[PDB]
């Protein structure tokens, strides 16, 4: 019993974190095979950060200008290239700790674990959702640039995120491991602000199922609804439209509890309009939207990894 | 910036979990050097779960009654002894991934990370706190017995909890790594029930300071209170009483923000009286009590680690 927000065990990734230094700036890198991956704004200075010329600044850099430390050991750089917003440093040694991995790009609403690091050292791990405005609400202090987010499938690590910057509202923005930003952001010291966010409706439903699985059920009612009636209510409360697809991923939970998806939907729409009656669900006084359906299944059936 | 419920990286503990089987019972064990630790109820059968005589049960076991597997590999048990409610199995191989570690016993309000495991394999990692009724509100399924709680300050792993059982209310009870239960609980399937759970006041106050550090200000007021008057009010909301030691502990955060501890107590008292008015603090719509003053400092100022 019980239900916590839960991250993937981080061991496979802590073996990959290194420290990267270019002049006065030091940040984190991801050492896989013989390549170290890190944000390309490491080559920047404070002077040319309002308008970087990243191709221009790169070639002028020597392979020995980049200093890569893995713990007490130094890594010689024998080459570099830039892929979108990610720098790649070729080193002469393969990482003996490289796990099975693959680079994936995630969809808004999907969750992942973040390994926050500083000076190449893993500091903490936590669970984030890719918000619909393509930010994540993380916890990142100065020097956490280059920290990575990931999921684990069986024994394959899926790297989905690499941290680049903080937005003025305190939310965070980054790229996939191929250097493409999530959302309408750029890595320049310019003025940027996240779009308007929406509740990940399917995640709220999954969380309500997790509450029912755990015996927390005061919100269930006798009513049902349809996609059309629900969505008209959802827009006015700034909720993501519930598609036919969403219902089918909720299938397993709809089976294991005996509450149909449109049945659960009528409970959620009542909570939207009436409120929570000063009560809590799963020890929360707000509708939690950072648990995906797979997160609830993985946690309420005990999937383990390697 | 930002503030999240954060766990320690789990790699150092992942290298230590193994699967321990006795008869038809399988749970998790902790493999450090040449000892594997696990809950001693792994040696119970179904006839010995109301009033098990563990000394009697254990002397009847041979080393070959215990199957220990680290992944693909079988560990040969060469001895066994009992320390309070924890079994210790000596094996012929020290664990090559044993980290630097120690065993500590924690006090209520303290937080730690939990590496939940099944059949010796990690399923996930989350943060917990030891409540004042000496339970934790974990997330455990059947087969999670033997999972451990830990902190990693610097490079030393501090093991402070091993999971033994779930109580009829959904909460969990366990031991330190010396086999002593937290609280009045026993590893018997007899009727047991958690004492009243109080809100961990010093942690709430710490979280409110973390909010101010992060820029939240809407809940501040111009009142201050005495320590006695605050405890009279907070008691009525089932809050833990605040001692002078707690006031000292909040001193550093108090200095960093400029808000006196007793003046933040006045803010908490008002929040209990009016609730949140639909607003949030640090992303939450209730008052969080699972962050220590130490947790707040580590996350809000330099952590590195």
PDB file of N, CA and C in Angstrom, chain A residues 28-61:
ATOM      1  N   UNK A  28      28.080  20.043 -16.314  1.00  0.00           N
ATOM      2  CA  UNK A  28      28.043  18.589 -16.316  1.00  0.00           C
ATOM      3  C   UNK A  28      28.003  18.036 -17.729  1.00  0.00           C
ATOM      4  N   UNK A  29      28.603  16.858 -17.893  1.00  0.00           N
ATOM      5  CA  UNK A  29      28.561  16.156 -19.151  1.00  0.00           C
ATOM      6  C   UNK A  29      28.116  14.723 -18.947  1.00  0.00           C
ATOM      7  N   UNK A  30      27.665  14.121 -20.050  1.00  0.00           N
ATOM      8  CA  UNK A  30      27.192  12.744 -20.082  1.00  0.00           C
ATOM      9  C   UNK A  30      28.161  11.942 -20.951  1.00  0.00           C
ATOM     10  N   UNK A  31      28.886  11.015 -20.322  1.00  0.00           N
ATOM     11  CA  UNK A  31      29.945  10.240 -20.970  1.00  0.00           C
ATOM     12  C   UNK A  31      29.385   8.894 -21.403  1.00  0.00           C
ATOM     13  N   UNK A  32      29.240   8.709 -22.700  1.00  0.00           N
ATOM     14  CA  UNK A  32      28.695   7.480 -23.246  1.00  0.00           C
ATOM     15  C   UNK A  32      29.638   7.008 -24.338  1.00  0.00           C
ATOM     16  N   UNK A  33      30.033   5.739 -24.282  1.00  0.00           N
ATOM     17  CA  UNK A  33      31.019   5.218 -25.216  1.00  0.00           C
ATOM     18  C   UNK A  33      32.213   6.170 -25.144  1.00  0.00           C
ATOM     19  N   UNK A  34      32.699   6.716 -26.257  1.00  0.00           N
ATOM     20  CA  UNK A  34      33.834   7.629 -26.209  1.00  0.00           C
ATOM     21  C   UNK A  34      33.438   9.077 -26.496  1.00  0.00           C
ATOM     22  N   UNK A  35      32.184   9.444 -26.238  1.00  0.00           N
ATOM     23  CA  UNK A  35      31.709  10.799 -26.492  1.00  0.00           C
ATOM     24  C   UNK A  35      31.164  11.370 -25.202  1.00  0.00           C
ATOM     25  N   UNK A  36      31.457  12.639 -24.956  1.00  0.00           N
ATOM     26  CA  UNK A  36      30.884  13.363 -23.836  1.00  0.00           C
ATOM     27  C   UNK A  36      29.915  14.383 -24.408  1.00  0.00           C
ATOM     28  N   UNK A  37      28.679  14.367 -23.915  1.00  0.00           N
ATOM     29  CA  UNK A  37      27.601  15.236 -24.376  1.00  0.00           C
ATOM     30  C   UNK A  37      27.366  16.324 -23.340  1.00  0.00           C
ATOM     31  N   UNK A  38      27.235  17.574 -23.777  1.00  0.00           N
ATOM     32  CA  UNK A  38      26.986  18.663 -22.837  1.00  0.00           C
ATOM     33  C   UNK A  38      26.396  19.843 -23.594  1.00  0.00           C
ATOM     34  N   UNK A  39      25.781  20.799 -22.891  1.00  0.00           N
ATOM     35  CA  UNK A  39      25.169  21.938 -23.587  1.00  0.00           C
ATOM     36  C   UNK A  39      26.210  22.763 -24.327  1.00  0.00           C
ATOM     37  N   UNK A  40      25.842  23.231 -25.527  1.00  0.00           N
ATOM     38  CA  UNK A  40      26.814  23.947 -26.339  1.00  0.00           C
ATOM     39  C   UNK A  40      27.132  25.328 -25.775  1.00  0.00           C
ATOM     40  N   UNK A  41      26.303  25.872 -24.878  1.00  0.00           N
ATOM     41  CA  UNK A  41      26.598  27.198 -24.338  1.00  0.00           C
ATOM     42  C   UNK A  41      27.731  27.177 -23.326  1.00  0.00           C
ATOM     43  N   UNK A  42      28.449  26.055 -23.213  1.00  0.00           N
ATOM     44  CA  UNK A  42      29.616  25.998 -22.343  1.00  0.00           C
ATOM     45  C   UNK A  42      30.758  26.815 -22.937  1.00  0.00           C
ATOM     46  N   UNK A  43      30.853  26.884 -24.274  1.00  0.00           N
ATOM     47  CA  UNK A  43      31.941  27.628 -24.911  1.00  0.00           C
ATOM     48  C   UNK A  43      31.733  29.130 -24.755  1.00  0.00           C
ATOM     49  N   UNK A  44      30.512  29.549 -24.437  1.00  0.00           N
ATOM     50  CA  UNK A  44      30.167  30.957 -24.341  1.00  0.00           C
ATOM     51  C   UNK A  44      30.887  31.628 -23.175  1.00  0.00           C
ATOM     52  N   UNK A  45      31.134  32.925 -23.331  1.00  0.00           N
ATOM     53  CA  UNK A  45      31.498  33.821 -22.242  1.00  0.00           C
ATOM     54  C   UNK A  45      30.310  34.727 -21.938  1.00  0.00           C
ATOM     55  N   UNK A  46      30.444  35.542 -20.886  1.00  0.00           N
ATOM     56  CA  UNK A  46      29.385  36.502 -20.578  1.00  0.00           C
ATOM     57  C   UNK A  46      29.258  37.553 -21.673  1.00  0.00           C
ATOM     58  N   UNK A  47      30.369  37.874 -22.343  1.00  0.00           N
ATOM     59  CA  UNK A  47      30.356  38.858 -23.420  1.00  0.00           C
ATOM     60  C   UNK A  47      29.467  38.402 -24.575  1.00  0.00           C
ATOM     61  N   UNK A  48      29.829  37.303 -25.232  1.00  0.00           N
ATOM     62  CA  UNK A  48      29.057  36.821 -26.383  1.00  0.00           C
ATOM     63  C   UNK A  48      28.004  35.792 -25.980  1.00  0.00           C
ATOM     64  N   UNK A  49      27.178  36.119 -24.983  1.00  0.00           N
ATOM     65  CA  UNK A  49      26.020  35.297 -24.658  1.00  0.00           C
ATOM     66  C   UNK A  49      24.715  35.972 -25.056  1.00  0.00           C
ATOM     67  N   UNK A  50      24.722  37.294 -25.253  1.00  0.00           N
ATOM     68  CA  UNK A  50      23.536  37.964 -25.773  1.00  0.00           C
ATOM     69  C   UNK A  50      23.333  37.658 -27.259  1.00  0.00           C
ATOM     70  N   UNK A  51      24.415  37.397 -27.996  1.00  0.00           N
ATOM     71  CA  UNK A  51      24.328  36.986 -29.400  1.00  0.00           C
ATOM     72  C   UNK A  51      25.484  36.055 -29.711  1.00  0.00           C
ATOM     73  N   UNK A  52      25.390  34.801 -29.282  1.00  0.00           N
ATOM     74  CA  UNK A  52      26.408  33.804 -29.681  1.00  0.00           C
ATOM     75  C   UNK A  52      26.456  33.555 -31.178  1.00  0.00           C
ATOM     76  N   UNK A  53      27.663  33.357 -31.699  1.00  0.00           N
ATOM     77  CA  UNK A  53      27.861  32.796 -33.038  1.00  0.00           C
ATOM     78  C   UNK A  53      28.477  31.418 -32.839  1.00  0.00           C
ATOM     79  N   UNK A  54      27.620  30.414 -32.634  1.00  0.00           N
ATOM     80  CA  UNK A  54      28.121  29.152 -32.094  1.00  0.00           C
ATOM     81  C   UNK A  54      29.049  28.430 -33.069  1.00  0.00           C
ATOM     82  N   UNK A  55      28.749  28.460 -34.370  1.00  0.00           N
ATOM     83  CA  UNK A  55      29.694  27.887 -35.326  1.00  0.00           C
ATOM     84  C   UNK A  55      31.037  28.602 -35.248  1.00  0.00           C
ATOM     85  N   UNK A  56      31.001  29.935 -35.151  1.00  0.00           N
ATOM     86  CA  UNK A  56      32.217  30.744 -35.107  1.00  0.00           C
ATOM     87  C   UNK A  56      33.025  30.457 -33.842  1.00  0.00           C
ATOM     88  N   UNK A  57      32.365  30.463 -32.680  1.00  0.00           N
ATOM     89  CA  UNK A  57      33.081  30.233 -31.432  1.00  0.00           C
ATOM     90  C   UNK A  57      33.639  28.818 -31.336  1.00  0.00           C
ATOM     91  N   UNK A  58      33.052  27.855 -32.052  1.00  0.00           N
ATOM     92  CA  UNK A  58      33.460  26.459 -31.906  1.00  0.00           C
ATOM     93  C   UNK A  58      34.825  26.191 -32.527  1.00  0.00           C
ATOM     94  N   UNK A  59      34.982  26.524 -33.809  1.00  0.00           N
ATOM     95  CA  UNK A  59      36.190  26.142 -34.538  1.00  0.00           C
ATOM     96  C   UNK A  59      37.430  26.763 -33.897  1.00  0.00           C
ATOM     97  N   UNK A  60      37.312  27.997 -33.398  1.00  0.00           N
ATOM     98  CA  UNK A  60      38.418  28.648 -32.704  1.00  0.00           C
ATOM     99  C   UNK A  60      38.849  27.900 -31.448  1.00  0.00           C
ATOM    100  N   UNK A  61      38.069  26.918 -30.991  1.00  0.00           N
ATOM    101  CA  UNK A  61      38.385  26.165 -29.784  1.00  0.00           C
ATOM    102  C   UNK A  61      39.237  24.947 -30.119  1.00  0.00           C
TER     103      UNK A  61
END
